[PDB]
Amino acid sequence: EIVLTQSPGTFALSPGERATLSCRASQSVSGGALAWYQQKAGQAPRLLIYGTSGRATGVPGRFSGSGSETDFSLTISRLEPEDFAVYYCQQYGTSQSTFGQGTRLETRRTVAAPSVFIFPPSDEQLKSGTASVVCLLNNFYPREAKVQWKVDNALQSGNSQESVTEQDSKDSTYSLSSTLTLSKADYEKHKVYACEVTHQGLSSPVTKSFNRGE
Amino acid sequence: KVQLVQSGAELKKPWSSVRVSCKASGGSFSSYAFNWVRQAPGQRLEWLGGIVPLVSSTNYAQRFRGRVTISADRSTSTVYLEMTGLTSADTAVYFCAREGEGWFGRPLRAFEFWGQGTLVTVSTASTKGPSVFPLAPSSKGTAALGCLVKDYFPEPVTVSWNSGALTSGVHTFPAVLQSSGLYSLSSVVTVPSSSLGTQTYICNVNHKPSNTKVDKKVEPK
């Protein structure tokens, strides 16, 4: 089996710049049988390059494919706003064909601090025997952020799940939602519930807290 | 224009079977290779197999040999995928991709035309509608509110705000798979703090697998 490995993992560039994505194969790829696809969130892949260097029908001219043997490259000469997506390489061997893990091209912007909000579990939820405390980190950049839950000033571990949105197509920011799940008994047990956020755009960690039943 | 329209999303129990279709429209059907590529949530593309309908020439990947059968109905210009021995590892979106047309229709190996994708979910969890809880705005600029869509199965749910009239500043987060077999997501929106008293904010949740339409009115604490 041929294993395709793409580099880098995530690229941060600005429109109008040149982007070079590399795809290396575990062994020699047959006579220039390399493909490059573009994929945006929620959609199917779009064929960009066929056969190492062939430009697909309708694909703009700024996309070019090059390489041979075990090293291939997709080059976008002048980045445009609609070019920021995930890019996959594919090897079309014989009786087998594989893909790379993909490279994500994100729009680069000024560092933005997250707007932190905290939501206690609603009474309608507490009437069902469970409690979900929510911490919202709205519109920040870059993607890396750290959320820590504290119940009566005690760091939690395992009882929290988070999710991050795609990069916003307008302001090029991200947003994170962290949910801490507790039993109704464990929620009525303590008093203080806080979420502490650490991000590049913050000189000091931002703690958003609330007291139970106020 | 060549169009590929796939079958609807499916939810199968482990160790059962799934059958996904792919109807082709527009260009020629019998003389090109239709393939099936699946993409697990947050993972890479994976080629399962393909077929050329003219000679019924099938070609499968070694990872799915004996598990995957790909056929074609030339009279209806439809390509079928049938997979057996399903497990939770097979939960993914299944695409049907046809190879490209080159000079004078020269086949291009590379997948130029794609279908919309079919979500196949393999799990023992039963279909359950979501509970919609209000994320009420703080008593304190800009105020953030939202709805928590918890304990539903399977994907997907659709969340709109004020029946679609409110779109700016909305963030519907990707759902996460809980410790149980159920999903949960949150949909928030930032609005002016002054409008909290004169503007009604309603979150519209639709979970069609359970025929569940829920409109939840979010109000301050």
Residue numbers in the entry:
A (entry chain L): 1 to 27, 27A, 28 to 213
B (entry chain H): 1 to 52, 52A, 53 to 82, 82A, 82B, 82C, 83 to 100, 100A, ...
Sentences reproduced from the published study:
MPER bnAbs show outstanding breadth, neutralizing up to >98% primary isolates, but have uncommon features. Notably, long heavy complementarity-determining region (CDR) H3 loops with aromatic residues at the tip facilitate bnAb binding to the hydrophobic MPER and nearby membrane. DNA sequencing revealed PGZL1 was from subclass IgG1, whereas most MPER bnAbs are IgG3s. Using X-ray crystallography and cryo-EM, we determined the orientation, angle of approach, and composition of the PGZL1-Env interaction.
